[PDB]
Amino acid sequence: AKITKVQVGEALVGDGNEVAHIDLIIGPRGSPAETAFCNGLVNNKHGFTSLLAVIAPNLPCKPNTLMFNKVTINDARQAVQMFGPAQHGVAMAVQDAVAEGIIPADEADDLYVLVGVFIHWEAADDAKIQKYNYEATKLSIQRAVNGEPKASVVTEQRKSATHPFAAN
Amino acid sequence: AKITKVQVGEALVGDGNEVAHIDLIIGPRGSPAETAFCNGLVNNKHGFTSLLAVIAPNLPCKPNTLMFNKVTINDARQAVQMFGPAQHGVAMAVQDAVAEGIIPADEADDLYVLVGVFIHWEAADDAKIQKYNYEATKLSIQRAVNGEPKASVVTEQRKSATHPFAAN
Amino acid sequence: AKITKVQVGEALVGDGNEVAHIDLIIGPRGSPAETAFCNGLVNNKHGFTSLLAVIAPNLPCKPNTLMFNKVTINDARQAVQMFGPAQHGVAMAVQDAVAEGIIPADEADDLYVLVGVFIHWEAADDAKIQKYNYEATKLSIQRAVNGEPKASVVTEQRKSATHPFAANA
Amino acid sequence: AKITKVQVGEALVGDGNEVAHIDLIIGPRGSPAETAFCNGLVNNKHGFTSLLAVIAPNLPCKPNTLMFNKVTINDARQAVQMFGPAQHGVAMAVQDAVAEGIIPADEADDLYVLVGVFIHWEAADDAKIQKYNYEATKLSIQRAVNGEPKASVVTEQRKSATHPFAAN
Amino acid sequence: AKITKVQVGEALVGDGNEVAHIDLIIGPRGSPAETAFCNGLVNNKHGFTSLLAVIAPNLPCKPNTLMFNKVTINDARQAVQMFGPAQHGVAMAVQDAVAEGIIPADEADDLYVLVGVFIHWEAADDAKIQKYNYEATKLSIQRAVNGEPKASVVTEQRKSATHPFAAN
């Protein structure tokens, strides 16, 4: 056991225009994570195509991971960022999580990961896109895998948190 | 116990261009709310991107909450309102509902909330956007959690209700 | 008991540019009607936003009802018609059906209704939009709740029906 | 019952610009055909609206049938073709199938049919659109109901088939 | 007994503008592969229409296969490539896999295949599109059916793989 149900993770890492913000879901075979993984892959639309995360072509990360963008992709520059530095970052994060035991190795062939990726339209430095997404994805997985933050923990610190875009 | 099935809530709070109108769904692990939560997160389209509600980046509200817009988002101003004052409002409403016992604390880690939010394209006051959405979301949760309004109650007062845009 | 599975209803009522045509689904908790209700509410697109049908803000009809448009909504005029006269009509039809026992009162809190609404882009009379949709929605519910028209009934009268846009027949 | 599981049918009938090509799914209550029927009806997008197939308004065909277009519908001419001659043709094909026993009469009230229809943007003859779609839909139903063509049959004749758009 | 759960395959084959890259899912009746197959066929949008893979019209490959594009289809040239050389290639790959026993013949009538295909907008040689997609689809099926690459294998070689658009 360990990851026996759907868990949701999230994390924002970085700064500048390359800042990464990952919204993530992970779950086992037979769970809604598997259903959304399949429903997600077959459904592409203009500006939003979902693809399997791969460390490189012919080397997908395992557990199977589906990546989808949040910001509308209007040109090749945006498409390559999403499926170049960000994809490699997300995929390496997933595989490093397995290597480090965060995602148990003996569960990796029966889990599905869904990763929502943020790339501001002014992002420019590939190295940062790749690093921040690697870090945000890894943090999201670590959190999701432990069901964190627990509701009691969020309740306790809700009043001290600061949302960047809050009216205040 | 208490929230053992899918419940739907709704509420309109506020006035002017910042008026809030929330269409909401809440349900437990294993229910259609969990399925729609996962199917919803992976599917973004131009003008409509769905994201996890967070009190602030790195502090999502629990229960896991998915937010989606009703009015087409054409620019950054609209995007920030939806995912700034409204998001903070929605997320705080969810966490305050947990703190206040409306959503039992011992159920918060196994529930999913889906929140449709309205922001007129002429909305301008962030403070109101945030406050009205916080209030509308809280009201919708309170209602949904009690399965209100009950059908018998709606039937009794259907003839005296006034829809602002109705012909008659 | 009564509405124990997914049922589909349809009806065209009215004339002129305000003519209503409703494509409807109703089903209980645990059925695909509930799944489509949830999957439908969270998924909005340009020109197509789905909302809960309400008699008025703060007074949604019960059973829970999801409304979706068939004709692309390009401006506020169209949006208000869909979620003004038509919404009020759809919602009242659902609530009147409960009041009249068409939808048993003791099942109303555990059912879901999905309503596809048609409003021609030249529709103009709000009173008609509201009335026709109320009438069409009510007819669709009554039909769906009884699983009508039954297949044997459609089979028997297929040759005499006349489609407004067919080549012939 | 005969049709206890999801079956897929397909058929191309006709020629010229009115040629019909149907991709079809049929299945019983409780199957993925019923789920896709419901998920399909509620989800309309620009250029693609799905509707119940009806022999005529106020007379839908039974089994319940959902129709969806393959070619983007940009104007009223295309919309009326799809939901006029083709709709009537599709709906009559379903009803004639029931009348002829291809779809058992005692199963017709508990089945769902999903019909993808093709109408080239240069199609012009309503009579042909109606006839070809009626014929293609009926052939697809007949094939689907028997699970044909069986895999062994396709395997045997794969080398002699000719795709009109293949390189060879 | 061979293919009892959902498996995911992927492969990139070829070069130049016709290079093929397949993201594939295969699964049995009753699995999320069947659900996504049905939900996928009924849902078409501008630039993205999904169709059954056929060796030729009136001869679909079996197991039932749904094809969907990754690159927005803006004109007939792109549409024909996707549903001509690529479709024939994908469908023949599926049928050859059955003939060769990769997909057991006695399981072929109860399996569903989902194929995401890539065709760069500058692709021009139909013969290559067809051949590369045939080989990439066949490789993806072979991999998927064996649950390959296994997580342990990806972990072992993650550091030596090279992604074309990211790199590290």
Chain center to CA of E87: 10
Question: In whole angstroms, what is the distance from residue E43 CA to residue C43 CA?
Answer: 13
| Kind of pairing between the strands at D59-60 and E7-13 | unpaired
Question: In whole angstroms, what is the distance from residue D49 CA to residue E161 CA?
Answer: 44
What resolution in angstroms does the PDB record give?
1.9
Question: In whole angstroms, what is the distance from residue A44 CA to residue B93 CA?
Answer: 33
% helix / strand / coil in chain D, to the nearest 5? 40, 25, 35
Cβ-in-10-Å burial (0-12, 13-18, 19+) of D137 comes to buried
The set of catalytic residues of E is: 21
Which of A46, A55, A108 is the closest to E161 by Cβ? Answer: A55
Which of A11, A114, A167 is the closest to B85 by Cβ? Answer: A167
Q: Does C12 touch chain D (CB under 8 A)?
A: yes
Per the structure block, which two tokens stand in for E110?
């109860």
Per the structure block, which two tokens stand in for E28?
């049995």
Yes or no, beta carbons of A44 and E157 under 8 Å apart: no
Q: Does B151 touch chain C (CB under 8 A)?
A: yes
Backbone torsions φ then ψ of D38, nearest 5 degrees:
-65, -45
CA distance from start to end of chain D: 42
Rounded to a whole number, what is the distance in Å from the CA of B96 to chain C's nearest CA?
Answer: 21
Residues 19-48 of C with CB under 8 A from B: 29, 34-35, 37-39, 41-46
Question: In whole angstroms, what is the distance from residue B20 CA to residue B70 CA?
Answer: 11
With CA atoms as reference, report the closest residue to D36 among D50, D48, D47.
D50
Which amino acids of E are annotated as binding site for substrate, given as ranges? 23, 52, 70, 72, 87
Rounded-to-10 torsion of CA E36, E38, E44, E50: 80
Which of B10, B27, B66 is the closest to C52 by Cβ? Answer: B10
Task: Answer positive or negative: Cα dihedral of B62, B64, B70, B73.
Answer: positive
Yes or no, beta carbons of A109 and E46 under 8 Å apart: no
Question: In whole angstroms, what is the distance from residue B77 CA to residue B120 CA?
Answer: 12
Yes or no, beta carbons of E62 and D6 under 8 Å apart: no
Q: Give the Å distances, CA to CA, from B48 to A71, B45, B70, B121, C46.
A: 10, 5, 8, 14, 8
Question: In whole angstroms, what is the distance from residue D110 CA to residue C12 CA?
Answer: 23
Question: In whole angstroms, what is the distance from residue E33 CA to residue E39 CA?
Answer: 10
Yes or no, beta carbons of E168 and A63 under 8 Å apart: no
DSSP code per residue over D5-43: S-EEEEEEE--GGG-EEEEEEEEETTSHHHHHHHHHHH-
Per the structure block, which two tokens stand in for E99?
């003939």
Residues 70-109 of A with CB under 8 A from B: 70-72
Query: Which residues contact residue D74 at a Cβ distance below 8 angstroms, ignoring those fewer than 6 apart?
Result: D47
With CA atoms as reference, report the closest residue to E166 among A75, A13, A81.
A81
- Decide if C116 contacts C23 (C-beta within 8 A): yes
Residue E68's DSSP bridge partners are E116
DSSP state at residue D85 = I
Inter-helix orientation angle E126-145/E87-99, to 10°: 40
Yes or no, beta carbons of E51 and D68 under 8 Å apart: no
Which domains are assigned to chain A? Answer: 1-168 (3.30.230.60)
Q: Which residue has the tokens 């148990």?
A: A104
Q: Which chain A residues are within 8 Å of E116, Cβ to Cβ?
A: 41-42, 44, 51
Which amino acids of B are annotated as binding site for substrate, given as ranges? 23, 52, 70, 72, 87
How was this one solved? X-ray
Question: In whole angstroms, what is the distance from residue E101 CA to residue C138 CA?
Answer: 55
Question: In whole angstroms, what is the distance from residue C49 CA to residue B117 CA?
Answer: 11
Rounded to a whole number, what is the distance in Å from the CA of B143 to chain C's nearest CA?
Answer: 10
Query: Which residues contact residue D77 at a Cβ distance below 8 angstroms, ignoring those fewer than 6 apart?
Result: none
Question: In whole angstroms, what is the distance from residue A49 CA to residue E3 CA?
Answer: 28
Question: In whole angstroms, what is the distance from residue C147 CA to residue C152 CA?
Answer: 12
Per the structure block, which two tokens stand in for C146?
């009884």
Cβ-in-10-Å burial (0-12, 13-18, 19+) of B76 comes to exposed
- Decide if C139 contacts C13 (C-beta within 8 A): yes
Per the structure block, which two tokens stand in for C104?
């048993």
With CA atoms as reference, report the closest residue to E95 among B61, C118, D150.
D150
Q: Give the Å distances, CA to CA, from C3 to B56, B121, C25, C93, D41.
A: 44, 41, 12, 17, 20
Q: Give the Å distances, CA to CA, from D16 to A51, C53, D20, E81, E114.
A: 37, 45, 10, 20, 31
Query: Which residues contact residue A132 at a Cβ distance below 8 angstroms, ignoring those fewer than 6 apart?
Result: A13, A14, A18, A19, A20, A89
Q: What angle do CA B154, B160, B162 make, to 5 degrees?
A: 95
Q: Does A110 touch chain B (CB under 8 A)?
A: no
Query: Which residues contact residue B26 at a Cβ distance below 8 angstroms, ignoring those fewer than 6 apart?
Result: B3, B6, B7, B9, B33, B63, B103, B111, B112, B113, B114, B141, B144, B145
Residue D10 has, within 13 A of its CA and on its CB side, a CA count of: 20
Chain center to CA of C21: 8
Segments of E44-88 assigned E as strands: 51-52, 54-56, 59-60, 64-69
Q: Does B133 touch chain A (CB under 8 A)?
A: no
Per the structure block, which two tokens stand in for D45?
């997008």
- Decide if A97 contacts A104 (C-beta within 8 A): no
Which of B42, B63, B96 is the closest to A36 by Cβ? Answer: B42
Query: Which residues contact residue C143 at a Cβ distance below 8 angstroms, ignoring those fewer than 6 apart?
Result: C9, C10, C11, C149
- Decide if E6 contacts A64 (C-beta within 8 A): no
Closest-CA residue of chain A to B88: A166
Question: In whole angstroms, what is the distance from residue E27 CA to residue A107 CA?
Answer: 19
The count of other CB atoms within 10 Å of the CB of residue A98 is 24
Instruction: Judge whether C72 is annotated as a binding position.
Output: yes
- Decide if C19 contacts C12 (C-beta within 8 A): yes
Yes or no, beta carbons of A47 and B42 under 8 Å apart: no
Residue B48's DSSP bridge partners are B45
Helices (H), chain A: 32-42, 76-81, 87-99, 126-145, 151-157
Instruction: Judge whether C23 is annotated as a binding position.
Output: yes
With CA atoms as reference, report the closest residue to A151 among C161, B113, E135, C78.
B113
Which of C44, C52, C109 is the closest to B150 by Cβ? Answer: C109
Q: Give the Å distances, CA to CA, from A8 to A28, A149, D108, E13, E42.
A: 13, 10, 42, 35, 29
- Decide if C42 contacts B66 (C-beta within 8 A): yes
The set of catalytic residues of B is: 21
CA distance from start to end of chain C: 40
Question: In whole angstroms, what is the distance from residue C11 CA to residue D56 CA?
Answer: 10
Rounded-to-10 torsion of CA E29, E32, E37, E43: 150
- Decide if D151 contacts E94 (C-beta within 8 A): no
Rounded-to-10 torsion of CA C129, C131, C133, C134: 150
Backbone torsions φ then ψ of D133, nearest 5 degrees:
-70, -35
